[PDB]
Symmetry: C3
C-alpha cells in the first residue's frame, strides 16, 4: 500500500466515504415519509458505492497499467466503475426533486452513461492522440447534461413549492461547478497531458468526490424539500 | 486504421450513426408533449450509443483476437456492447407504443439480454463446436421475442388508436425482418462457419444496423402516434 | 469437461435449471391477469439466467485461475454474473408481493449489488488476507438486506390480504435460511479457507441455487397471492 505516494489520499477518501455512509444511514433511520425515503435511499447508496471503490484503489485492486507515450502508466480504472453508478444516482436526486418527466430522466441517465463510458475508453486507449478524441466526446455529453439542468429543470423548479425550488437551485449550482472540474483534472493529469503528477491528481479527485457526494448529500438531506407537504 | 480492409464500412457506419443522432437531436428540440419526449429520448440514444461503438471499432479498440480453428480470429466485441443497450431500447419504443404491461416489458428485456449475452459468449468461445451451442440458445431467445411481438402486442395494438396501430404494425414488420438477418450473418461470417469474409460481413452488419436504428427512428418520429390525443 | 471432478454437479445444475425454466414457461402460458404476469416474468427469468451460467461453467468458459497461497486456484467467476442479476430479481418478487415503496426497493437492490460486487472482488483478489476483508463487507450488505426483509416488510405484509401475508412469510423464511448459507460455503470453500474441496463446494452451491430459485418459484407461482382480488 504505502509504496504508492498517493496512498494517503486514497485512505482519506475511503474513511470520509465510509463515515458519510454511516451518518446518512443513521440519520435515515427515523424516516417514514415515502417521499423522504426515496431521497435517503438514493443519497446513502452514493457514498457506499464510492467507499468500496476507494477501498479497491487503496488495496491495489482497482489499478492497472496502460502503455502509452512509451511508458507503463498507472491508471485507476475503479474510478469509472464508481462514477458509472453514482453519477446517475446523483442526477436522479435532482430530477425527482423537480418531478421531472420520464423522457427527460432517460435522456440524462443515457447521456451520463455515454459520458462515463467514453471516459473509460479514453483512459484505457493505447494510442496517445486518440485518448483526447474520447475526452472530447465525453465532454460533449457532459455539456448536454449541464444544458438540461439549466434550460429544462430550472424552469420546472420555479413552478414548484418554494423550498424545493430554492434547494434545487443550490444543488444545481454545486453540481455544475464541481462536475465541470473533473474533465479538467483528467486532461492535465496522468490520464491526459501528464502536467500534474498522479499523487496531486489523486488529491484533487478526492476533494471533488467528497464534496460532490457527501457535501451534496448533507445539503439535500437537511432540506425540507424531501418531505411531502403534510399537516 | 486503413490496414484493415473493413475500415471503409466502419467509417461509413460511424458517419451515418453520428448524422442520425444529430438529426434526431435537432428534430426533438421543439417538442413539449411528455409522451413524445419519451420516444425522442429513447430513439435518439440508440444511434448515439451505436456511434460510439462504431468509432471504437474504427480506431481498433473494440477488436480482439480469439484462437479457434488453429487461427487467431479477429472478433469485434464492441458490437455486443452496442447491442446490449440499443436492442432493449428499441423494444421499449415498441412496447410503449402499444402501452404494454410491465410484466411483458420485463420478459422482453430479459430475453433480449440473454440473446445478446449468449451471443457474446459464443463469439469469445475457443472450442469451435461450442460456439454454435451458444448461437442456438441465443436464437431461441430471439424467437421468443419475435413470438411476443406477434402474438401479444399485435392484438394489443388493434384495441388502440388507429394511428398507433398502423405505425406499430409497420415498425413490427421492419423489426422482425431485420433482426432475423443478424443470426444468419453471424453463422456464415467470421464468428461462425467463415464462409463470408470479414470485410463483407462488416458491410452487412452496417446496412442492418443503420436500417434497424436510423431507418426505424425516421419512421417512428415522423408518426403522429407518439403524441397524445390533444385538441 | 469430465476432466474436472465437479463436472457432475455442474451438469445436474444445468439440467435442473433448464427443466425449471421450461415448467414455469409452460405454466405461465395460460395467464392474463396483469399482476400475475409480473410474477411469472420475474420468476421465469431467474432459472433461465442461471441455466446459461451453469452451462458456461460446465463447458469451462466461466472458470479462471487466480494465484494466491502460492497456487493457481480455480475460481468459477460465472457464479457472480448469475447472482448479479438473479438475486435482485428474487428480491423484487418479495417486494412486489408486499407492495413495498420505491425507496425501499432501491435500497434493497443497491445493497444487493454491493453484496455481489464485493464478493466478486474478494474472489479475484490475489492478496490472501484481503479476500476476507471483501467477504466481511459483502456479509454486512447481506445483513442489511435480511434486516429489511424482517423489520420493514413483515410489518407491511400483515396489513395486506391474508393470502399474500402467509405466502410472503413462507418465502421470507426460505430466503433468509438459504441465502445465509452462501457466505458460509464461500468462507470454508476454495474461495476462502480451503477446508472443503471444490467438488463438494460445487455440490453445495448447486443444492442452494436450485432450492433458492426453482423451489422458491414453485411456492410462489402456486399461490393465489400473485393474482389480484377479482370476482
Ligand atoms: C428505506 O429507505 C432508507 C434506506 O436507505 C439507506 C439504505 C442504504 C442505501 C443501504 C446500503 C448500505 C449497505 C448496508 C451496505 C453495507 C456496507 C457499507 C459499504 C458499509 C460502509 C461503512 C463502514 C464499513 C465503514
Ligand atoms: C443507456 C446507457 C446506460 C447507455 C450506456 C452508454 C455506453 C454504451 C457508452 C459506451 C460504453 C462502452 C465503452 C463500455 C466499454 C467497457 C469496457 C471498457 C470493458 C473492458 O474492456 C475493454 C478491453 C480492455 O481494455 O477489453 C478487452 C477485450 C475483452 C475480450 C472484452 C470482452 C468483454 C466486453 C467488454 C463485453 C461488453 C460488456 C459491456 C460493455 C458491459 C457494460 C460496461 C459499462 C462500462 C457500460
Ligand atoms: C427531453 O427529451 C428529449 C431529449 O432526447 C434526446 C437527448 C439525447 C438522448 C442525449 C444523448 C446525446 C448526448 C448529447 C451525447 C453527445 C455525444 C454524441 C455521441 C455526439 C455524436 C454526434 C457528433 C459527435 C458527430
Ligand atoms: C435481466 C437481463 C438483463 C439478464 C441478462 C442476461 C445475462 C445473464 C445473459 C448472460 C450474460 C453473461 C454471459 C455475460 C458475460 C460477460 C463476459 C463476456 C465479460 C468478459 O469476460 C469473459 C472472459 C473472457 O472471455 O473473462 C475472463 C475472466 C475474467 C476474470 C472475468 C471476471 C469478470 C466477470 C465478467 C464479472 C461479471 C460481470 C457481469 C457479467 C457484467 C455484465 C456484462 C453484460 C455482458 C451482461
Ligand atoms: C408475459 O409474461 C409471461 C412471460 O414470462 C416468461 C417469459 C420468460 C422470462 C422469457 C425468457 C426465456 C427465453 C425464451 C430464453 C430461451 C432460452 C432458455 C435459456 C431456454 C432454456 C431451457 C432449454 C434450452 C433446456
Ligand atoms: C446500484 C447498484 C447496482 C450499485 C452496484 C454496486 C457496485 C458498485 C459494487 C462494486 C462493483 C465492482 C467491484 C465491480 C467490479 C467488476 C470487475 C470485477 C470486472 C473485472 O475486472 C477486474 C479486474 C481483473 O480482476 O480487471 C482488470 C483490469 C481491467 C482493465 C478492468 C477495466 C474494465 C472495468 C471493470 C470497467 C468497469 C465496468 C463496471 C464495473 C461494469 C459493472 C460490473 C458489475 C460486476 C457491477
Ligand atoms: C462522485 C463523482 C462524480 C460526481 C464524478 C463526476 C465525473 C465527471 C463529471 C467526469 C467527467 C469526464 C469528462 C467530462 C471527460 C473526461 C473524463 C471524465 C470521465 C473525467
Ligand atoms: C441495432 C442493432 C440491432 C437491432 C441488433 C440486433 C441483433 C440481433 C437480433 C442478434 C442476434 C444474434 C443471434 C440471434 C444469435 C447469433 C448472435 C447474435 C447476437 C448476432
Ligand atoms: C440464486 C442465487 C442466490 C440466491 C445467491 C445468493 C448469494 C449470496 C446471498 C451470496 C453471498 C455472499 C456473501 C454474503 C459474502 C461472501 C460472498 C457471497 C457473494 C457468496
Ligand atoms: C480544476 C482544478 C485544476 C487546477 C490544478 C492546479 C494544480 C496546481 C498544483 C501544482 C502543480 C504541480 C506541478 C509541479 C509538480
Ligand atoms: C451536523 C452536520 C455534520 C455531520 C457530520 C458529517 C460527517 C461526515 C463527513 C463530512 C465531511 C465532508 C463534508 C463536505 C466538505
Ligand atoms: C441475410 C443475408 C445473408 C446473405 C449473404 C450473401 C453474401 C453474398 C456475398 C458473396 C459471398 C462472398 C464469398 C466469396 C468471397
Ligand atoms: C427528411 C427525412 C430525411 C432526413 C435526413 C436523415 C439523414 C440521416 C441519415 C439517414 C440515412 C439512412 C436512412 C435509412 C436507410
Ligand atoms: C452451510 C453448510 C456448510 C456445511 C459444510 C459441511 C461439509 C461437510 C462435508 C465433509 C467435509 C469434507 C472434508 C474432508 C474432505
Ligand atoms: C407439480 C409440481 C412439480 C412440477 C415439476 C417441477 C420440475 C422442476 C424441477 C424441480 C426440482 C427441484 C425442486 C426443488 C427441490
Ligand atoms: C443488461 C442491460 C439492460 C438494460 C438496458 C437499458 C434499457 C432498460 C429498459 C428498461 C425498461 C423498463 C422495464 C420496467
Ligand atoms: C447491477 C445490476 C442490477 C440490475 C438487476 C436487474 C433487476 C433490476 C430490478 C429493478 C427494480 C426496480 C427499481 C425501481
Ligand atoms: C452549455 C450549457 C451551459 C451550462 C454549462 C456550463 C459549461 C461549463 C464549462 C465546463 C468546461 C469543461 C471543459
Ligand atoms: C415463432 C414466432 C413466429 C415469428 C418469428 C419468425 C421467425 C423468423 C425466423 C428467423 C430465422 C433465424 C435463424
Ligand atoms: C440482523 C438482522 C436479523 C436477521 C438476520 C439473520 C442473521 C443470520 C446470520 C447469517 C450468518 C452469515 C455469516
Ligand atoms: C497528441 C495531441 C494530438 C491532438 C489531438 C486533439 C484532439 C482533440 C479533439 C477535440 C475536437
Ligand atoms: C463443428 C460442428 C459441430 C456441430 C454442432 C452443432 C450444434 C448446433 C446445436 C443446435 C441444436
Ligand atoms: C490470513 C488471515 C488474516 C485474517 C484477516 C481477517 C479479516 C476479517 C475482517 C472481519 C472484520
Ligand atoms: C468507519 C471508519 C472507516 C475507516 C477505514 C478505512 C480507512 C483506511 C485506514 C488504513
Ligand atoms: C458529423 C460527421 C461525423 C463524421 C466523423 C466520423 C467519420 C470518420 C471519418 C474518418
Ligand atoms: C431440457 C434438458 C436440458 C439438459 C441439457 C443440459 C444437461 C447437460 C448434459 C451433458
Ligand atoms: C460543496 C461544499 C459542501 C459544503 C457541505 C456543508 C453543508 C452543511 C449543511
Ligand atoms: C427499413 C428501411 C427504412 C427506410 C427509411 C426511410 C423512412 C423515410 C420516412
Ligand atoms: C426450499 C425447499 C423448497 C421445496 C419445493 C417444493 C415446493 C412444492 C410446492
Ligand atoms: C446561491 C447558492 C450558491 C451555491 C454555489 C456554491 C458553489 C460551490
Ligand atoms: C458555471 C461555473 C463553471 C465553473 C468551472 C470551474 C472549472 C474548474
Ligand atoms: C405493411 C408495411 C410493410 C413493411 C415491411 C418492410 C420490410 C422491409
Ligand atoms: C418474417 C419474414 C422473415 C424474413 C427473414 C429474412 C432473413 C434473411
Ligand atoms: C416440462 C413441461 C411441463 C409439462 C406441463 C406441466 C403442466 C402445466
Ligand atoms: C412457516 C414456514 C416455514 C418455512 C421454513 C422452511 C425452511 C427451509
Ligand atoms: C434464521 C435462521 C438462520 C439459519 C442459518 C443457517 C446457516 C447455515
Amino acid at each position: 500500500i504505502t509504496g504508492r505516494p498517493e496512498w494517503i489520499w486514497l485512505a482519506l477518501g475511503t474513511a470520509l466515504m465510509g463515515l458519510g455512509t454511516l451518518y446518512f444511514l443513521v440519520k435515515g433511520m427515523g424516516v417514514s415519509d415515502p417521499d423522504a425515503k426515496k431521497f435517503y435511499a438514493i443519497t446513502t447508496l452514493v457514498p457506499a458505492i464510492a467507499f468500496t471503490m476507494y477501498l479497491s484503489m487503496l488495496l491495489g485492486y482497482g489499478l492497472t497499467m496502460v502503455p502509452f507515450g512509451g511508458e507503463q502508466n498507472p491508471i485507476y480504472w475503479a474510478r469509472y466503475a464508481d462514477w458509472l453508478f453514482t453519477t446517475p444516482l446523483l442526477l436522479l436526486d435532482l430530477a425527482l426533486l423537480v418531478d421531472a418527466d420520464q423522457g427527460t430522466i432517460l435522456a440524462l441517465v443515457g447521456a451520463d452513461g455515454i459520458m462515463i463510458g467514453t471516459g473509460l475508453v479514453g483512459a484505457l486507449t493505447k494510442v496517445y492522440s486518440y485518448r483526447f478524441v474520447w475526452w472530447a466526446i465525453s465532454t460533449a455529453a457532459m455539456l448536454y447534461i449541464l444544458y438540461v439542468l439549466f434550460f429544462g429543470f430550472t424552469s420546472k423548479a420555479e413552478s414548484m413549492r418554494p423550498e424545493v425550488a430554492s434547494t434545487f437551485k443550490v444543488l444545481r449550482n454545486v453540481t455544475v461547478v464541481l462536475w465541470s472540474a473533473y474533465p479538467v483534472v483528467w486532461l492535465i493529469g496522468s490520464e491526459g497531458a501528464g502536467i500534474v503528477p498522479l499523487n496531486i491528481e489523486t488529491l484533487l479527485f478526492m476533494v471533488l468526490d467528497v464534496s460532490a457526494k457527501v457535501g451534496f448529500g448533507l445539503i439535500l438531506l437537511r432540506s425540507r424539500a424531501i418531505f411531502g407537504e403534510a399537516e
